[PDB]
Amino acid sequence: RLIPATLYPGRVILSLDFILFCLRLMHIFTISKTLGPKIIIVKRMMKDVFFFLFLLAVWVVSFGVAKQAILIHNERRVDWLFRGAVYHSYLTIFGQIPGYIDGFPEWLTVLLLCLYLLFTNILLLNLLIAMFNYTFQQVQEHTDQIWKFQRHDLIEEYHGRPAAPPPFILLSHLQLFIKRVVLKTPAKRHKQLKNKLEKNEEAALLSWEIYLKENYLQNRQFQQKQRPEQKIED
Amino acid sequence: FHSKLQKVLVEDPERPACAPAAPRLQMHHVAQVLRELLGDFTQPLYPRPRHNDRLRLLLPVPHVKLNVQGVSLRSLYKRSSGHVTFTMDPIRDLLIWAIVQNRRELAGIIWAQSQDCIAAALACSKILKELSKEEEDTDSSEEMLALAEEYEHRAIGVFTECYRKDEERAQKLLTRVSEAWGKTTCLQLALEAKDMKFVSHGGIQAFLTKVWWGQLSVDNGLWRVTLCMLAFPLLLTGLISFREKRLQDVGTPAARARAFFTAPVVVFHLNILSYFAFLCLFAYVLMVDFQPVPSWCECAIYLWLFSLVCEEMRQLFYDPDECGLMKKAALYFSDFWNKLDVGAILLFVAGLTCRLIPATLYPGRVILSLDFILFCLRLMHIFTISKTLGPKIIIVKRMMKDVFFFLFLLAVWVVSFGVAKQAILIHNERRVDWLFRGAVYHSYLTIFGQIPGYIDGFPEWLTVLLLCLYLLFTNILLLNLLIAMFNYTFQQVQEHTDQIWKFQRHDLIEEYHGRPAAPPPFILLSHLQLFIKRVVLKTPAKRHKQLKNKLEKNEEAALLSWEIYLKENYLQNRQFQQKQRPEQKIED
Amino acid sequence: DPIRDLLIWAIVQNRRELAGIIWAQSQDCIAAALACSKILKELSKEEEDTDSSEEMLALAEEYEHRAIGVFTECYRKDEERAQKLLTRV
């Protein structure tokens, strides 16, 4: 975007770079309870899509040249040779058989229309259905609970942030980095909401939890005895 | 089985192969029908040929000296075979007689003193799985399905005992000839009985990861193994080390080279690269160098593909024994991926002649374009490598084997649209041969939503509706059948069909590690390493590709006594959890 | 702490019920049950190869279930002290 010789990739690369922020955008907007778990469904999808990229990138290539093997078209100049044989022939997977261009055994491509159409839908879009059949377990009942597990995992990451905005966080960096030159060793206000334990505070607590543990100790063996399978074992 | 033997007694009566007589029940008659109850095995425990020929012992034809009758060892002829005492193994034979009489628990007692600790349980699992499928028709065939899985589970706990203590001897245990069960190397039986829980048992997966390497062990990554493939001095850096180089035994660059050839993956990763480059230059010669004279690239496009015809031929040399020709080819034309390997060369017979005959140069480009798809089928069959990759290609086996009419169902359903849409109007983008083309090809290009805007660019409510009517049973009849055909492959998917991928994994790795490391342009030199070896020799006994284990008899007795000692060490353990079953105690 | 160390020596010898008896006098009422749940989940995944690794998957979920009923006891009575309980050093 700054070198004048490559200003076309100044718009092209940063357009692709916007997609990489869009990935984190979904990663940061997966907030609520109905929202959350299915972004993780498209983790185990998308971690498995990493070849379904290349499987697509294998499967597309055998179509557009083969369709233009019927005829090498004429919407074409010296550098639209390598473009028209490729880019017009491989824009066609949004159903976009290039009407831009034109606008003896002819039974073959009538069939070959469906032959590629078959294992688009069979090989890639039953694999839509098949890759769903890896994330098929404890879905409403317990993977929704796995959302609550990763929820506070992220909330401690994102409540553990200074409240200054990113244009005002360099001032908060200057609240800490030139604090290091008037101090020596890092002992400043670190972000933590922990609990410091007085030893007399512990003994009032931990004796009661152990007293609750013996209060639970009779209760855990009780339902072991209240198990009717124990009684027929008795 | 007894109804089979009386049929076998008239499948081999007096006339065809027992020329004096055979109306009465003999051992080889049971062995021949035990031979169909095995597959790729040898013939154990029940010796068949002229040294124990139990086929003709009913009418007087003379003894040992003339070899035409009997066993040629027992020097007395009294209408039997004498006291051929304990022919190979008595207890292994009682495993047969209980299961062919369907004696369930007593064969497990015969298992408790069976010398074959492991593969005999698969032998009680394999035929009983066939007898599940062959004939009981109800109430026992379903039961011996549930019995063979416990008989498989009998074989699992044997490997539990041997692998947890001195696994080095248990490493050999899956490679023995063992002189007992037609050697079968203990995996070729395990690959035949389909053994869905047995081959996915734990330390076996720890063991097949040691078959996965040799002198080329772990701490090598998938990204950095390809960097040492193309770059030969990069292998000599601080990157990938051998077991020799770990022990500092690489003192020769040829030893750094020749051990690199012997990998299960380096041969395979050359088939990743050098095979796929033939598919890419295929488009380059087709777009540009379509010239009917043999050019420098047209001479180059033959150097890879005819050698690939010889690769499956070289695989066909690795198929048979030293006696079989037509049956091993008959097994080759039964596998569906090997049925798809026909057309990839078949249209290259037709389309290349079209590429050379000037009168048919348009099919010289059309047929070979369709022939590229047939290599694409094998391309998916060869790139279905990794664990996340593998099982769903087999999902689109039971899809695609069921798609074989969904081709024609599509080929029924499309046809009723495009003529019917052009029944509204027969269009005008048309000449004398675009009549048959414009009424068909423009009207049947329309299933990529491609209602032909090329062409144009009283109850009109009907096709407004008929737009949706065809659209309905495209999505209803064919694309709920998308959902419906998924509902045949719906069982044990993440948990156990993924284990079925591990089952077919080493099935393929023994096929593809069992290859010479020469590339297909250099394999004709390796054919000349073998075929003009046949003219300086006489009989095939050269270096055959096999990683088996030869068993010294004193080596066996140190091993097999310990496995039997481990079997009695397991024998108390199997009955213990039967007693530790609480349902046994309320039965007590 | 001696009793917290006997929780290790039973599980690294795969002693199932005796560690639960060591749990019955374990001073760490809550996080020790997760400590018998965490490493036993690794030892499920690391190496037993059959018949116990699957069992200690089914044991760690009860060892997790051991830790659940501890929070059942503390939160239902004086949850204010149980509010601190998830923040102690």
Ligand SMILES: [Ca+2]
């Ligand atoms: Ca093959």
